[PDB]
Write an enzyme that holds these catalytic residues in place. Structure first.
Site, PDB file in Angstrom:
ATOM      1  N   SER A  44      14.622 -13.154  -6.936  1.00  0.00           N
ATOM      2  CA  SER A  44      13.522 -13.822  -6.240  1.00  0.00           C
ATOM      3  C   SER A  44      13.296 -15.233  -6.729  1.00  0.00           C
ATOM      4  CB  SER A  44      12.235 -13.024  -6.322  1.00  0.00           C
ATOM      5  OG  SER A  44      11.827 -12.841  -7.663  1.00  0.00           O
ATOM      6  N   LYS A  83      13.125 -25.219 -20.123  1.00  0.00           N
ATOM      7  CA  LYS A  83      11.725 -25.008 -19.754  1.00  0.00           C
ATOM      8  C   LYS A  83      10.983 -24.152 -20.764  1.00  0.00           C
ATOM      9  CE  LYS A  83      12.144 -25.863 -14.925  1.00  0.00           C
ATOM     10  NZ  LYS A  83      12.456 -25.456 -13.536  1.00  0.00           N
ATOM     11  N   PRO A 135      33.367  15.270  -4.144  1.00  0.00           N
ATOM     12  CA  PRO A 135      33.292  15.590  -5.576  1.00  0.00           C
ATOM     13  C   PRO A 135      34.647  15.511  -6.301  1.00  0.00           C
ATOM     14  CG  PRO A 135      32.328  17.366  -4.237  1.00  0.00           C
ATOM     15  CD  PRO A 135      32.880  16.363  -3.278  1.00  0.00           C
ATOM     16  N   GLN A 176      17.074 -11.975 -15.357  1.00  0.00           N
ATOM     17  CA  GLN A 176      16.241 -12.561 -14.288  1.00  0.00           C
ATOM     18  C   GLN A 176      16.596 -12.075 -12.889  1.00  0.00           C
ATOM     19  OE1 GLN A 176      15.005 -16.807 -14.780  1.00  0.00           O
ATOM     20  NE2 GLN A 176      15.770 -16.570 -16.869  1.00  0.00           N
ATOM     21  N   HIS A 193      11.400 -10.171 -13.663  1.00  0.00           N
ATOM     22  CA  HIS A 193      12.153 -10.708 -14.779  1.00  0.00           C
ATOM     23  C   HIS A 193      11.873  -9.886 -16.004  1.00  0.00           C
ATOM     24  CE1 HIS A 193      13.205 -14.063 -12.400  1.00  0.00           C
ATOM     25  NE2 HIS A 193      12.408 -15.005 -12.938  1.00  0.00           N
ATOM     26  N   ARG A 208      21.019 -14.173 -14.947  1.00  0.00           N
ATOM     27  CA  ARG A 208      20.605 -13.489 -13.715  1.00  0.00           C
ATOM     28  C   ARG A 208      21.262 -12.107 -13.672  1.00  0.00           C
ATOM     29  NH1 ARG A 208      16.931 -16.144 -10.784  1.00  0.00           N
ATOM     30  NH2 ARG A 208      18.243 -17.994 -10.493  1.00  0.00           N
ATOM     31  N   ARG A 246       4.831 -30.812 -13.758  1.00  0.00           N
ATOM     32  CA  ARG A 246       4.452 -30.053 -14.975  1.00  0.00           C
ATOM     33  C   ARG A 246       4.328 -30.870 -16.254  1.00  0.00           C
ATOM     34  NH1 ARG A 246       8.564 -25.035 -13.957  1.00  0.00           N
ATOM     35  NH2 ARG A 246       7.329 -24.266 -12.167  1.00  0.00           N
ATOM     36  N   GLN A 279       7.952 -11.569 -10.870  1.00  0.00           N
ATOM     37  CA  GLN A 279       8.168 -13.002 -10.790  1.00  0.00           C
ATOM     38  C   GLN A 279       7.283 -13.660  -9.756  1.00  0.00           C
ATOM     39  OE1 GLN A 279      10.079 -14.835  -8.066  1.00  0.00           O
ATOM     40  NE2 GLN A 279       9.305 -16.688  -9.087  1.00  0.00           N
ATOM     41  N   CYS A 334       8.327 -19.363 -14.146  1.00  0.00           N
ATOM     42  CA  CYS A 334       8.124 -17.938 -14.154  1.00  0.00           C
ATOM     43  C   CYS A 334       8.471 -17.279 -15.497  1.00  0.00           C
ATOM     44  CB  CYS A 334       8.919 -17.290 -13.024  1.00  0.00           C
ATOM     45  SG  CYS A 334      10.669 -17.698 -13.000  1.00  0.00           S
ATOM     46  N   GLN A 358       5.104 -25.183  -1.289  1.00  0.00           N
ATOM     47  CA  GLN A 358       6.199 -25.718  -0.471  1.00  0.00           C
ATOM     48  C   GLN A 358       7.426 -26.164  -1.267  1.00  0.00           C
ATOM     49  OE1 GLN A 358       6.458 -25.482   2.773  1.00  0.00           O
ATOM     50  NE2 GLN A 358       8.304 -26.713   3.017  1.00  0.00           N
TER      51      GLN A 358
END
Lengths: 375, 374
Positions: free
Chosen positions: A166, A245, A194, A163, A280, A273, A103, A356, A136, A74
């Site tokens: 998502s 991280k 063309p 990355q 990723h 990104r 974490r 990911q 991730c 969630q």
């Protein structure tokens, strides 16, 4: 088959991937699943439900407390609200969570069992009750490069990432695809002719990219046709929270001293990104502690777990196998572009790609459930 | 106003950017332009010709030898055909070329004048007649980071790149855009329905991407929605030709010993294609020779040339100013994300974006012409 397992956030994107994997692997035959919702509590639970055919209230402490295990996708705001209340009420069950919130707590373990099963098992014996998926980026890097860390060969690593949308969420994925439409639509007739002039096509695409019709409410800026060299919060010191991280979680997963202390492994770099849906990729500069032969490095990497593979360092194989197109929706974690860099035999390049939503989100959570079941 | 300057490959993509830039800067006012053609010799020259209103023959050694300077965007196969013939026939004019063919020849200079004007001017005095643009990746990297090299502060650098389609050519750009159509087209109805399921959209996009209708004849594989971690020839040793150019050309542009010799600076890394039109971006790990304060680094980078732009190392500024959306079609070369890395004060990160067709292709060529004109 009587472990009562609460599922929260199962309706969202990460949760949906989790439900699909749990169904595929037969996990629901091993537990009594209890489905929670932030809305529509009292409505019908999903098909996966067995005896608990009614949705429970996600913020009801009394209903959460009846679970032996809670698996939540969630998010952090939910954890920060409900988790302290639930523990304060005396709940002694297992909390398995994708969110970053817990974490770095001393009474939580960051879980990536193909890499740190030992850290997980020691913590379970020591009475630890909180088991948290890692970022991730870190999970995917370690699924690929974990063998080198296991052999204590890594002095330091920089990671420059590529990355996917998502990681930012479903609405970000939708915006990426809408942006692709804006850019292609600006030149659809010219592409079909063309004889059309490339500099006209280029002018039209840029005008569309930077114009009012380009949908940018989710990213803030264009992603299709572009890139975004900052992910997550600005820490005020030239580092993003995403980049932070890397070192913090790598060292904690591996059971090493904190980042910056003796015995830790420096992991740092830039998180960027690009316009990919859900894989990723990362380009690594790795300093090893000694000059290990490449053949030996390949073996150390390939043998580390059941999902890594080493892609031969050749053009065709790299183009076809080391990409989001090949890896999306799969549990495979290829690593390739492995060679010694010009600075010396202790310097190793690598490029890795991983989904990911799988190893980077849902997969470690169901695997932790299996560890609790001894299954 | 009497320097006779031959233009070859002026109708192609790089040549067309060059023509636009030469017009913008008034270059044609200073020369007598002679336009060459591979397919319409004797036909009508572009209307910004002056006295030479007929197209000359691109493979006529007689027509070519009348030029004081030849600027060619026609490509390496053309250079390898006509150049040796022209020289062997005794032509002693200046050859300005975008192609890689002559870059590493001992009687050629790789040109990037905001970085190596000294190398160019010394070469002119010493009688050098061949002035060749560098690879787009290296030129763009040096436009941004050249200050640190010029101060002799770099021990080594790795570059992980995010390269645009334009480097591969016009048909590759078109394929990238067609691919974006394939992916969006597979889900346009679903995107317009707020209640559609994201995993359905995702499934449909992947099926389109890897299906037979995805146009992949130019890249070989999908680019839109993906990336391609190999550019140019396989050298058989785990390095691409694009990656090899980094060390080779950086050292030669700067007038340093050849890559791998004492005194050369190692530049290496991985070159990866992404779904951008015409800007290349690069993420760098730089080891400096000493622990230089970040303010001093910023000043050294910013002061190096008139086009580099340091972007403050902040979220808003980086998102807005350090991207292909900002840079495409401009002469600006932003560099940002500059901070010390965890390994120590001698380790520096950087991220730079530059237009591949301007500083990475056409611009150094017209600037070299200006150098010859004084």
């Amino acid at each position: 088959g009587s472990m009562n397992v609460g599922l929260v956030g199962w309706r969202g994107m990460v949760g949906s991937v989790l439900m699909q994997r749990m169904q595929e692997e037969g996990d629901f035959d091993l537990i009594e699943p209890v489905f929670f919702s932030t809305s529509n509590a009292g409505g019908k639970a999903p098909s996966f439900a067995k005896n608990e055919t009614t949705l429970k209230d996600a913020t009801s402490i009394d209903d959460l407390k009846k679970c032996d295990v809670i698996i939540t996708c969630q998010g952090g705001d939910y954890t920060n609200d409900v988790f302290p209340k639930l523990r304060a009420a005396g709940w002694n069950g297992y909390w398995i969570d994708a969110a970053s919130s817990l974490r770095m707590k001393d009474d939580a373990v960051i879980i990536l069992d193909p890499v740190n099963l030992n850290v997980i098992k020691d913590a379970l014996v020591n009475g630890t009750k909180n088991f948290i998926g890692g970022n991730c980026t870190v999970s995917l890097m370690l699924m690929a490069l974990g063998g080198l860390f296991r052999e204590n060969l890594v002095d330091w690593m920089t990671a420059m990432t590529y990355q996917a949308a998502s990681g930012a969420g479903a609405q970000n994925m939708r915006e990426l695809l809408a942006q692709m439409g804006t850019l292609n639509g600006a030149v659809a007739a010219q592409l079909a002719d063309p004889a059309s002039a490339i500099l006209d096509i280029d002018r039209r695409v840029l005008a569309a990219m930077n114009g009012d019709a380009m949908p940018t409410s989710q990213f803030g800026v264009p992603l299709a046709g572009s890139l975004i060299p900052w992910i997550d919060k600005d820490l005020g010191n030239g580092m993003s929270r995403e980049e932070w991280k890397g070192g913090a979680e790598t060292n904690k997963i591996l059971g090493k001293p904190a980042m910056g202390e003796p015995g830790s492994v420096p992991v740092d770099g830039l998180c960027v990104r690009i316009g990919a849906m859900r894989c990723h990729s990362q380009a690594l500069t790795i300093k090893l502690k000694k000059d290990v032969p490449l053949d030996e490095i390949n073996g150390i990497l390939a043998s580390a777990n059941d999902w890594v593979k080493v892609v031969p360092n050749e053009r065709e194989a790299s183009m076809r196998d080391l990409s989001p197109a090949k890896v999306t929706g799969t549990l495979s974690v290829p690593v390739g572009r492995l060679r010694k860099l010009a600075m010396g035999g202790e310097y190793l390049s690598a490029f890795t790609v991983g989904d990911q939503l799988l190893w980077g989100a849902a997969e470690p959570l169901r695997r932790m459930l299996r560890i609790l079941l001894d299954k």
